[PDB]
Amino acid sequence: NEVLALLSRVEAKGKGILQQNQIIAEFEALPEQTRKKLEGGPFFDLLKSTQEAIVLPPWVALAVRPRPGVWEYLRVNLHALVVEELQPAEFLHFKEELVDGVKNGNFTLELDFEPFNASIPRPTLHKYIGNGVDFLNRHLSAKLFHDKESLLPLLKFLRLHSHQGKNLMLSEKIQNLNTLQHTLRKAEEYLAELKSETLYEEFEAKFEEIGLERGWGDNAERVLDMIRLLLDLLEAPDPCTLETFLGRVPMVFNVVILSPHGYFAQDNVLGYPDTGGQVVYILDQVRALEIEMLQRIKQQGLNIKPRILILTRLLPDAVGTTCGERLERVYDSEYCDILRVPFRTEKGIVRKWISRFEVWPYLETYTEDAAVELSKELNGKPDLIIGNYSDGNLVASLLAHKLGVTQCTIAHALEKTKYPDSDIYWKKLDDKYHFSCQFTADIFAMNHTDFIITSTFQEIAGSKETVGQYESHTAFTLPGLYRVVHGIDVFDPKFNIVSPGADMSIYFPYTEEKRRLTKFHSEIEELLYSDVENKEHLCVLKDKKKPILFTMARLDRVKNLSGLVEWYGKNTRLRELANLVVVGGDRRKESKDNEEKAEMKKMYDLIEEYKLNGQFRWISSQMDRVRNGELYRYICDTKGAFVQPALYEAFGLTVVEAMTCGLPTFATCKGGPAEIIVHGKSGFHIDPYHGDQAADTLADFFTKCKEDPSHWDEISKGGLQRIEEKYTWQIYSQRLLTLTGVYGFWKHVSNLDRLEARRYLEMFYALKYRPLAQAVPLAQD
């Protein structure tokens, strides 16, 4: 095909010196090409997998991705027959040259985390992505099988295990596998005799004699299965046994959760800058976590009272909010509190809200302050530390290091994918977004943590056609700063997919009448349909009978609300069928946020340009989740739909909330919602990059729904069952806890290999992050 293949690069040439993405790629090349396309041979086809290609003079470089998590880079001659296979670094060189004009100084930093991971083998099966604990178990199960030097670690573990000055599992009486083996067998013979429901307290005395401390279970039956479980790990370890035992051992009692940025609170917040899905997730998480812990604790026959602290910034000048108080009990829980610590410098505490992009210079000092405070509140040290987002993961990493605690991170979003080419173009973005800091923190926490939780597969490995969020951090470069050769690997056994949900008593199907909160209908109707225009709501709905196209979200550039508004403004077919109600931004107060401010000015203009008055209602931030639920269900009444038009959406809780209430959802294909929604079944995908087709798809739906109302009900059911299956909080907590067990034990076995990695990070943090963070200007009060 030397004729045909020439013809492609040919088209590529004129395109000039620039970034070739996939769409921006052959979508130009192939579809602008004649019947000569005829490419169903290898060249077009296998290289339909080109993720991006670097356009320069006689060479063009391109990154290819046959399968998720598998990359190969190539350099093909602009005019020539030659293709030479590039190394990751060589490829990244191109990107550097394209911006600065030259590559990075030869001796300028190159991060390679590859050699530091080598402890466990790396699974190559797509199946094991986001499944690592499964993999880790098979590795431990196999390494444990008849190996002395291997088993000791497990015995040392149970012997050292204690909480608040009480011994658990094995006592000091057991010095070796022989006594342990002998004692367990000795215990088993005894217990197999007793009535199943016999309380531990009965056989406690004897158990203390032979070296068994509390926590095996609350009764004979339970203690029995457990002793039988461990005896088995000593004898013939299998992965399922190993997990079950480790997950059962009472461990997690105290938990520390990190969420520094935003206005973190239970009221009067949601919709403010940086306040949103993260805050929601965390409050649901702790409540779900606390129920599971009280249980595991009670089943294991212990009386410890758990504690969960959520750490965040104390903001003294936020008014209307509880953000200025140090300690706050979380709704519907006994043991979960929000702990607030202030940011400070040499000159004293900093009062004013700071954007999440600007917090960096404060975090290290924050970390120390937090350690002191959370130490005051906890009886015992943290049994698990979970970081959230970047600041959260950064701080949680420093703390876990400092307190030697099992650490888990949860990204909630990765900015590198929200802001396209923000890595290569970072320099000009930097005075505003400080991405050099963020990406640094992101890499550091990502490799520092023990395990990683994600809400979907796509967060990790993306899909067959497109690349996942974490995966996009495998190899990248920030020209002038440093180059990341292997930053992360999609196959890492630390990745674990644990899907969240929507609080089921906030969000239920709109069709359950007795449950509908009808006291909210008066206000909901003023909200939507009233003729008043003010800071709460702008414009007016001229027609109250139409279905409502609805969206609710934080207002910023990536949420792309102004985009939706344009698509709708322009589409008369859609405008005639539905009213557009957009909730975003708080216009009650002058916005302090750059993007929100910008985004708001667009909304105003679009109102004027498309003469949107009468079909459009623009609603400020809706902060009560409880009424929020009813809002969703109310839209169902009108037979409307939810739309999520983000340019990228990391997960999309609102998409999960809508589906739970029975509201048919059209959500962006870029990011998490691609995995949540099964197209034509659980909802529909739209592409924010083709807005007019999104608008038309919506129109198609309402049109079909008009002629056949069963169509609406179909998707509503599809959505409801799709949540029932994938997204709920019941499985979450347990999975999370089991993980703490397996990854905690793993710490001790894998201990000494992570020493090298522990220094690389320590040094990366110190020599790279700190100086960058310090560079970021301080806020002035």
Ligand X SMILES: O=c1ccn([C@@H]2O[C@H](COP(=O)(O)OP(=O)(O)O)[C@@H](O)[C@H]2O)c(=O)[nH]1
Ligand Y SMILES: OC[C@H]1O[C@](O)(CO)[C@@H](O)[C@@H]1O
Binding residues for ligand X, rule: CB under 6 A, are 270-271, 276-278, 280, 552-554, 583-584, 621-623, 625, 628, 651-654, 657
Among 97, 238, 364, 637, binds a second copy (CB under 8 A): 364
Nearest CB to ligand X, comparing residues 247 and 585 = 585
**Angle CA(423)–CA(424)–CA(429) in degrees, nearest 5?**
70
Is 456 within 8 Å of 673 (Cβ atoms)?
no
CB of 167 to K ion, least distance (A): 5
Residue closest to K ion when measured from CB atoms: 161
**Which amino acid would we find at residue 539?**
C
User: What's the chain's Rg over C-alpha atoms?
Assistant: 28
Nearest CB to ligand Y, comparing residues 186 and 412 = 412
**110 interface partner picked from a second copy, ligand X, ligand Y, none, CB below 5 to 8 A per type:** a second copy
Residue closest to ligand Y when measured from CB atoms: 276
Q: Does 112 bind a second copy (CB under 8 A)?
A: yes
Nearest CB to a second copy, comparing residues 394 and 577 = 394
Among 412, 554, 625, 768, binds a second copy (CB under 8 A): 768
Nearest CB to a second copy, comparing residues 396 and 541 = 396
DSSP 8-class letter at 497: E
Which residues would be at the binding site for ligand Y (CB under 6 A)? 262, 274-279, 356, 389, 412-413
Q: Does 167 bind K ion (CB under 5 A)?
A: yes
**621 interface partner picked from ligand X, K ion, ligand Y, none, CB below 5 to 8 A per type:** ligand X
CB of 278 to ligand Y, least distance (A): 3
Long-range Cβ contacts of 430-439 (<8 Å, 24+ apart): 432/357, 432/594, 433/357, 434/357, 434/358, 434/360, 434/776, 435/478, 436/478, 436/481, 436/772, 437/360, 437/769, 437/772, 437/773, 437/776, 438/357, 438/360, 438/390, 439/415, 439/478
Q: Does 372 bind a second copy (CB under 8 A)?
A: no
**CA dist., res. 392 & res. 444, Å (int):** 12
Nearest CB to ligand X, comparing residues 313 and 412 = 412
**389 interface partner picked from a second copy, ligand Y, K ion, none, CB below 5 to 8 A per type:** ligand Y
Nearest CB to a second copy, comparing residues 112 and 204 = 112
Written as six digits, the tokens of 357 are 């992009």
Among 45, 172, 267, 368, binds a second copy (CB under 8 A): 368
Residue tagged 């005051």 (tokens): 376
Nearest CB to ligand Y, comparing residues 275 and 665 = 275
Among 136, 169, 311, 414, binds K ion (CB under 5 A): 169
Among 34, 106, 522, 710, binds a second copy (CB under 8 A): 106
Nearest CB to ligand X, comparing residues 552 and 720 = 552
**CA dist., res. 544 & res. 634, Å (int):** 13
Burial of 507 (0-12, 13-18, 19+ CB in 10 A): buried
If residue 74 lies in a helix (H) or strand (E), which one and from where to where? strand 70-77
Q: Does 775 bind a second copy (CB under 8 A)?
A: no
Question: Side-chain half-sphere of 357: how many Cα atoms within 13 Å?
Answer: 15
Q: Interface residues for a second copy in 721-760 (CB under 8 A)?
A: 752, 755-760
**161 interface partner picked from ligand X, K ion, ligand Y, none, CB below 5 to 8 A per type:** K ion
**768 interface partner picked from a second copy, K ion, ligand X, none, CB below 5 to 8 A per type:** a second copy
Is 95 within 8 Å of 479 (Cβ atoms)?
yes
Binding mask 170-209 for K ion (x = CB under 5 A): x---------------------------------------
**CA dist., res. 602 & res. 180, Å (int):** 70
3-state SS assignment for residue 405: coil
Nearest CB to K ion, comparing residues 251 and 452 = 251
**CA dist., res. 323 & res. 36, Å (int):** 64
CB of 59 to a second copy, least distance (A): 23
Is 584 within 8 Å of 621 (Cβ atoms)?
yes
Backbone angles phi, psi at 319, to 5 degrees: -110, 150
CB of 158 to K ion, least distance (A): 6
Which residues are CB-contacts of 390 (< 8 A; sequence separation ≥ 6)? 356, 415, 438, 441, 442, 445
Q: Interface residues for a second copy in 401-460 (CB under 8 A)?
A: 402
**CA dist., res. 397 & res. 417, Å (int):** 22
Which residues lie near a second copy (CB under 8 A)?
A: 105-112, 115-116, 364, 367-368, 398, 402, 482, 752, 755-760, 762-768, 770-771
